[PDB]
Write a protein that binds this ligand. Structure first.
Ligand SMILES: O=C(O)CNC(=O)C(=O)O
Ligand code: NI
Length: 437
């Protein structure tokens, strides 16, 4: 009989200490009045401005719209990827940084100082966690250094299509069992929970279970207005969590140390520069000339081409143009990444021209093909996929406000583009060439 425990159970606290000690609870009374007020107003102000969107994610080969509406706020340039969906931050006024609106801007600043507070609290609890055990400081710091927060909202009246928690009888899930993805290893998660206005169905909870385990009773922690909780250290790997919906509207701010080593603007721009190092860059025009046809440089060039195409452009435009409502931060850089990408289409075309010329001895030609074939095939496949993902029956359900675009995309007739969008014919011919005997 799979069951769960709440504070009403005799064994709840002992079971908390024994099998969920890296979960920590900070009651609303630990956070100042003024911060509570400011943070709640910020939630209401972002909601009023319609800044929260259910995400069209992908899970086990299926297109699925998250019951919760969400918004990512964090360090300018930074991204958070989950369920094959890359969220772009609406930026908060971090040091040394004209893109958002008055009220919206104010709300970001507010979640910034909320971030400062939780980070200090996270550091305290981690120091205490280390002090308990055995009965570096830089590790701690880095594992409390929240660079983003994913805000969640749900009005169970307006979103009643909630699944039943299937293992412990926790009732309705606002967010189903999961691990938070794309997180720096052993990094903490801090959560401020704002409700309006077995377990009490009417009240929001966060649920926890041990991974692989539905025999250990799950824990259901009641959240009220301003209660925060923290997942410390490896809790997020060793356990799964969910959100059990109550009956009133509720928000949360989930601060994370996103693992953005390949997930920031500066990083992708640097990779684009790396790739274009192989092109004569005296002038910006269509006659792309390449400096080298060394297998490794061409492989890299085509790989980066794929990276900016599908991890940045197609992602951004698939959700888009939707965070344009809250900010114009990404307009210019996404245009730039597209200009850099269009050049890479020029580069690919120049590689194809080089393989397709008379003088090239068969041996070097085959070198080139082998270096670029994996990338071009991944290009065709990821293009089919994204194009389908933009045209699914549920993408088309979304308002024009959030209509997914399949950009960049062009027809055959389009003279402005050197290569067709569909590479089936090209990839087929390269395969045949490599098979030539
Ligand atoms: O909203 C909460 O309390 C918990 N949030 C999540 O688990 C999440 O969005 O990943
Ligand atoms: Ni989560």
């Amino acid at each position: 009989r799979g069951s769960h425990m709440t504070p009403k159970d005799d064994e709840f606290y002992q079971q908390w200490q024994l099998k969920y000690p890296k979960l920590i609870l900070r009651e609303a009374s630990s956070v100042s009045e003024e911060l509570h007020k400011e943070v709640q107003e910020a939630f209401l102000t972002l909601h009023k401005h319609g800044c929260l969107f259910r995400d069209l994610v992908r899970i086990q080969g299926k297109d699925l719209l998250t019951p919760v509406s969400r918004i990512l706020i964090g360090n300018p340039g930074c991204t958070y990827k989950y369920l094959n969906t890359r969220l772009f931050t609406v930026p908060w006024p971090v040091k040394g940084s004209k893109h958002t609106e008055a009220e919206i801007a104010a709300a970001c600043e507010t979640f910034l100082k909320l971030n400062d507070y939780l980070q200090i609290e996270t550091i305290q609890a981690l120091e205490e966690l280390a002090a308990k055990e055995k009965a570096d400081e830089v590790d701690i710091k880095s594992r409390a250094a929240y660079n983003v927060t994913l805000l969640n909202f749900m009005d169970p009246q307006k979103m009643p299509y909630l699944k039943e928690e299937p293992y412990f009888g926790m009732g309705k899930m606002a967010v189903s069992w999961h691990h938070d993805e794309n997180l720096v290893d052993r990094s903490a998660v801090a959560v401020y929970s704002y409700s309006c206005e077995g377990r009490d169905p009417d009240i929001w909870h966060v649920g926890f279970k041990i991974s692989w385990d539905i025999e250990t009773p799950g824990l259901a922690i009641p959240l009220h207005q301003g209660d925060c909780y923290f997942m410390l250290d490896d809790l997020n790997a060793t356990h799964q969590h969910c959100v059990l919906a109550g009956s009133q509207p509720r928000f949360s701010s989930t601060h994370r140390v996103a693992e953005c080593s390949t997930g920031t603007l500066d990083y992708i721009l640097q990779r684009c520069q790396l790739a274009l190092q192989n092109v004569c860059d005296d002038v910006d025009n269509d006659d792309v000339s390449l400096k080298s046809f060394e297998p490794a440089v061409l492989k890299q060039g085509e790989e980066i081409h794929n990276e900016v195409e599908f991890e940045w452009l197609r992602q951004f435009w698939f959700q888009g143009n939707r965070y344009r409502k809250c900010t114009d931060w990404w307009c210019q850089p996404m245009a730039q990444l597209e200009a850099l990408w269009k050049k890479m289409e020029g580069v690919t075309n120049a590689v194809l021209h080089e393989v397709k010329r008379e003088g090239l001895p068969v041996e070097q030609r085959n070198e080139i093909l082998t270096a670029i074939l994996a990338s071009l095939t991944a290009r065709q496949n990821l293009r089919r996929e994204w194009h389908a993902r933009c045209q699914s029956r549920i993408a088309r359900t979304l308002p024009a406000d959030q209509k997914p675009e399949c950009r960049p995309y062009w027809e055959k007739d389009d003279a402005s583009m050197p290569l067709p969008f569909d590479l089936t014919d090209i990839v087929s011919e390269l395969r045949g060439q490599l098979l030539e005997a």
